[PDB]
Design a protein around this nucleic acid. Sequence first.
RNA 1: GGUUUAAUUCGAAGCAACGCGAAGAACCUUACCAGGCCUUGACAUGCUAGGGAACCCGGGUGAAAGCCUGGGGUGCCCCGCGAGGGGAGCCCUAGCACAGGUGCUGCAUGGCCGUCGUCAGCUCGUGCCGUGAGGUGUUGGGUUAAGUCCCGCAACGAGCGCAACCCCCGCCGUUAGUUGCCAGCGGUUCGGCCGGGCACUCUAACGGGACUGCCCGCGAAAGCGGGAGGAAGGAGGGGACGACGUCUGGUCAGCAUGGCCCUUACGGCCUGGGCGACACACGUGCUACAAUGCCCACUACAAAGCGAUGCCACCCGGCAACGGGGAGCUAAUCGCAAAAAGGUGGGCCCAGUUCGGAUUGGGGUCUGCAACCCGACCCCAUGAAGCCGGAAUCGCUAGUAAUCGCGGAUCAGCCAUGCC
Lengths: 80, 63, 98, 60, 24, 206, 62
Amino acid sequence: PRSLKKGVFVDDHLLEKVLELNAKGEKRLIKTWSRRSTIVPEMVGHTIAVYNGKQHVPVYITENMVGHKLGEFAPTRTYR
Amino acid sequence: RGGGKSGQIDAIKLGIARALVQYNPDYRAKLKPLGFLTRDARVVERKKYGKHKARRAPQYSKR
Amino acid sequence: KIRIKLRGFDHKTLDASAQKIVEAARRSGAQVSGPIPLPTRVRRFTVIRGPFKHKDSREHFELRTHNRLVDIINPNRKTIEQLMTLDLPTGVEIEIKT
Amino acid sequence: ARKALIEKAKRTPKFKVRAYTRCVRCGRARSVYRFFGLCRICLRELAHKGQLPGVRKASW
Amino acid sequence: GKGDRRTRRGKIWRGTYGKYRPRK
Amino acid sequence: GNKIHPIGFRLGITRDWESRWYAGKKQYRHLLLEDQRIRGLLEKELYSAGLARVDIERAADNVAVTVHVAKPGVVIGRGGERIRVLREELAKLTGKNVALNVQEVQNPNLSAPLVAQRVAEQIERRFAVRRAIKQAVQRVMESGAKGAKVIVSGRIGGAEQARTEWAAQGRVPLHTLRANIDYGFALARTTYGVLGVKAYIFLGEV
Amino acid sequence: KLEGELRAEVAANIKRLMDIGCYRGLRHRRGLPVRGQRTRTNARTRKGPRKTVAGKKKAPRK
RNA sequence: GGUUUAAUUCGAAGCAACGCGAAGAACCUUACCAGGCCUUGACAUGCUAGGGAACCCGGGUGAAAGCCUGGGGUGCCCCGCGAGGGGAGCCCUAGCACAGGUGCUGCAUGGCCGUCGUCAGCUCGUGCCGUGAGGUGUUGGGUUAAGUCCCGCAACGAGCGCAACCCCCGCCGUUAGUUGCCAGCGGUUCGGCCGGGCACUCUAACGGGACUGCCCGCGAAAGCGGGAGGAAGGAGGGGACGACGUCUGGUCAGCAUGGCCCUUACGGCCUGGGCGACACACGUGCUACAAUGCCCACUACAAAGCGAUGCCACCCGGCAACGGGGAGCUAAUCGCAAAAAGGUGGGCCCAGUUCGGAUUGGGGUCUGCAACCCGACCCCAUGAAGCCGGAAUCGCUAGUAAUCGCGGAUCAGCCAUGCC
Ligand SMILES: [Mg+2]
Ligand SMILES: [Mg+2]
Ligand SMILES: [Mg+2]
Ligand SMILES: [Mg+2]
Ligand SMILES: [Mg+2]
Ligand SMILES: [Mg+2]
Ligand SMILES: [Mg+2]
Ligand SMILES: [Mg+2]
Ligand SMILES: [Mg+2]
Ligand SMILES: [Mg+2]
Ligand SMILES: [Mg+2]
Ligand SMILES: [Mg+2]
Ligand SMILES: [Mg+2]
Ligand SMILES: [Mg+2]
Ligand SMILES: [Mg+2]
Ligand SMILES: [Mg+2]
Ligand SMILES: [Mg+2]
Ligand SMILES: [Mg+2]
Ligand SMILES: [Mg+2]
Ligand SMILES: [Mg+2]
Ligand SMILES: [Mg+2]
Ligand SMILES: [Mg+2]
Ligand SMILES: [Mg+2]
Ligand SMILES: [Mg+2]
Ligand SMILES: [Mg+2]
Ligand SMILES: [Mg+2]
Ligand SMILES: [Mg+2]
Ligand SMILES: [Mg+2]
Ligand SMILES: [Mg+2]
Ligand SMILES: [Mg+2]
Ligand SMILES: [Mg+2]
Ligand SMILES: [Mg+2]
Ligand SMILES: [Mg+2]
Ligand SMILES: [Zn+2]
C-alpha cells in the first residue's frame, strides 16, 4: 500500500549515471545522496552507496528488491 | 422554519397560543397562568475559550 | 433597471450614503426600491493573547462587511448625471451593474 | 527571525512547495494570518492601534 | 463504531466517502 | 497580565481608526503593508514636528494621508520645499499618487502621544524622571483636561533593578467606554536599556 | 487464496522484506510498528505487555 | 520525563509546565547532526588606485549549492576630423568602515502575557487623634453579587476598583422588498416555477420596552418576602471589561533592547539526516468494551461559516478514493452541504458476537521535484487488547452536564482525536 500512479519515479541524475555504466562494465560503488529514488531493473548489479545523513553505504543490489525505494536499505538512526 | 423538531413543537405551541388571543382577547384568563403566552428564552450558550464547551472545563492534574 | 451593491466596513457611513444615492426623489421620478438591508459577512480572527505559551488566554477580533442594495427602476438620464461627483464617504464601495 | 532567513524574498523558490509565509512586519513564521500577512502577535498590536481598518474587539 | 473505516458512522467521522458511505 | 489597550478597547465608539478604507480579501493584505511603509517613512522623518497621528484614507486608486503635527512649520520648510519633497518621497513607495495634508495640533499638552513623546526625550537627556512625570502631568492638567496619568517603565536612572514610576491626577476612568482617553506610548532608548512611557489623558464624557 | 495457502503466503511474504536489506524487515525483526508510527509511547499492540524497568536514582517519587 | 543518538534544535515546572510557544516538522519550515561549499557576505549605508563594465542564450564538473571556462554585446553624457583620452550609472575583483549571529544573560530591560482574581478591595486631600511608626475616614448596626446602597459617627469629600456606558440573546414598532407565500385571487412542465403583492418569516439599521414603577405584608431607611400586569421582574441569559499590588512569575526563540560573546565561523548556502528515535513512566485526549446497542435501506428538522488561479452542481468511467467532461456562482441568488442523533422498515440474538478496529500482508488514488526514514485517503484480506477499570482523581447548578453532527483558522498535502 504505497504510491506510484501513472507516473513512476526515479531521481534522474543517478539514472543517467547507471544506464551509462550499462554500455560496458559495472562501477564498483556509486556515491548517491538521493535515497528518494525507486530501484529500476537496470540497477540490479552495480552496488550503489546510499547516503545516511552520515555515511554512504555498500548497498548491494539483488533482483529480489526491485520495486523498493533506495533509502529503505540505509537505516538512518542507530539503536542499542 | 429552523432548528429542530422538538423546538418546533414548542414554537408552534406559542404560535397557537398567540393567535388564539388575538381572536378573543378574553382567552388570556384561561391561558396566561398555564404559561403558554411566555416565550422560552432559553437558548444555547456560547462556546468559551479555554473551556471545552462553554462550561465543560478541561481536566487537570497535580493539585 | 440599474443594480448597485453597496458595501463597506462601517454601517453608519453606509446607510448615510446609500441614502444619498436615493436622491433621485423620495418616490416621484423613478421607482426607488429602498435601501435594501442584505446580510453582513463576519470574518473572525482568534489570537492567543501573549507571545510564548499561555494557551488558555485568547482574544477575539472580527472584521464585518455590511452590504446594501437599493436598485433603481427606469433610469432617466438626469438621475444618472447625479451619479457624478456627489459623494463624501471614503470607506464605502460601489458595485454597479444594469 | 534571522535576517538572513528572509530568503522568503527569493522570488523563485525553485519549487513552489518551498514557498512559505513570514510576518511582513516582524518575520514570525508561525501564525501568519494570510488575510493580513501579519503574524498573530503583530495582528493584535495593529488591531489595538486601530491601523487595521474595520477590525474590532469582537464579543457575542 | 466511529473507528471502523468501513461503516456509515465511521466514514462520517473521518470526513470521507466511498463504498461504505456513497457520496450519493 | 491585565489592562487592554485603552484605544483598541474604545475603538468601537469614542475613538475612530487611524487608517479608514475598504478592501477585498485579495487587496487588504497589500494596502495594509504599503499603509505601514508610509507610517514608517513618516514617523522617522517627521520626528521634529512631533507627529501625534497619521490618518490614511483610500479610494479610486488615490491615497489621502492627513498628518497631525504640533509644528506644521517643519513639514512645510522653504515655504513648500519640504512638503513637496515628502509628498514626492511617498510617490516612490506608493506608486498610487499620494496627497499629503497637515493638521495643526492645538494643545500638544492634550494629546497623549505627544505628552509621552515629550517625557521619552527627556529621559534620554537624563532629566530627573520623578519630576518629569509629575511635571508632564501638570502641563496636561493645566491645559484643561478632566484627568491624566503617565507611567515610566523600568531602569529609572541607570538603576540596576528595573522599577516603575507613576503620577496621575484627576479622573482616569479606564473601564468606562463612554470616556475618551487618548493613550500614547513613547520609547526611550537610553544608554543602559530601554524604557517605556505610557500616557493617559482623560477628557469629556458622552 | 484462502486459509493455509494464504497464511504461509503472508508469512513468506514478510520473510521477503526480512531477507532483503529492507527497513520494514528490520521493523518486522525487532517487533516494532512497521507502518511508521510512534514508539515513544503507545506501541503496545506490536510490543507485547509492558517490560517495566527502574526509572530513577535521585529524583522525587515518580 | 527518561533513556538512546551523529543529531533526536530550543523553550515551558505544583496550582499558574506537560493536544503549552507550534492556527499544519517529508524537502521548505530549521534554530540540530553529518558531509560538499561561501566569503564585503543571502540583506544596509558607504570610502581609495586597479581591469572591464546595461546584458542575452552556452560548456565542464557536481547530490545540489558551488567552482571552472568558451561566446556574440559593447551602448548614454563632454574634448578630438580621427586612432583614441577623461567620465554618470549598474556589473568586478583585492583590501578597509561595516553586515550577520534563534550565541549568553527575564540572574540589566521594554513590550505583551500568566497568576492570586471579577476576588471587593487599594488609596488620596483636608481636618481630627498620637512624641512617633501610625490611626480616624474604610471601624459599628442593617443590606448587597459588590467599601452595593441605608443608618450611624471627628470626620468631610475624592481617585483607582464595583455598578453603569459597548456587544450577542429574549418581546414589540418604524424604515427597507432579485431572500421570504395554500397569507389572498390567476396560471402550473404541481418546483414560490410564472404573473404578482410584502402582509408573514427573514435580513439589518434606527427606536420602544424594566423603573422595585404598581398592589399586600415586615422594615428607621436601604432593602426583604409575596402578588399583578408583562416576552421578560429585581443582576432576564451570555460576552467584552480585571484595582494598588504580589509572584525578582513567563518570555532576550515574535518584536524590540543594555551588557557580554564569535567574526575563512557561534555568520552564509546547499544535498541528506534529525525534530517521528524506543526497555520504560506521566499528562491531556480519542475510540471502545455493546440490545437505552450495532448494521443496511428509506425519510425529517440546524446554526455558524468558507469559496477565483477557489467551491465544484450535473454527466460519464471506476467497488471506491478519484480521473475525464462540464454548469453556476466575484455568491441572502452558485457551491461546499450529507447535518447527525431522530423517525419508519429490515437484519443481528448475549456471543469477544453483525460488539471493538488496534496490528499486519496485499492492490490502488490524490497532493507535491520528491511521500524509505515520515502524508492523507480508498479497496481486499487480517480482526489485537478491551466484559466498564486499584490506590487515587477531574468537570458540571440549566439549554448546564451528558450526547449528536456542522464550520473555520493554519494549510500543496497532512499525521485534526487538537484548537476557536
Ligand atoms: Mg549532470
Ligand atoms: Mg452543544
Ligand atoms: Mg482570562
Ligand atoms: Mg533579529
Ligand atoms: Mg508549506
Ligand atoms: Mg462494527
Ligand atoms: Mg550529546
Ligand atoms: Mg534560550
Ligand atoms: Mg484559571
Ligand atoms: Mg528538515
Ligand atoms: Mg562612469
Ligand atoms: Mg552588530
Ligand atoms: Mg517583563
Ligand atoms: Mg464583581
Ligand atoms: Mg499611644
Ligand atoms: Mg500632631
Ligand atoms: Mg478601624
Ligand atoms: Mg458594616
Ligand atoms: Mg463604590
Ligand atoms: Mg464593570
Ligand atoms: Mg419585528
Ligand atoms: Mg390557482
Ligand atoms: Mg421601599
Ligand atoms: Mg526560564
Ligand atoms: Mg515535536
Ligand atoms: Mg510528564
Ligand atoms: Mg459510477
Ligand atoms: Mg429495528
Ligand atoms: Mg463506566
Ligand atoms: Mg456556579
Ligand atoms: Mg464521548
Ligand atoms: Mg487543511
Ligand atoms: Mg472539526
Ligand atoms: Zn509579526
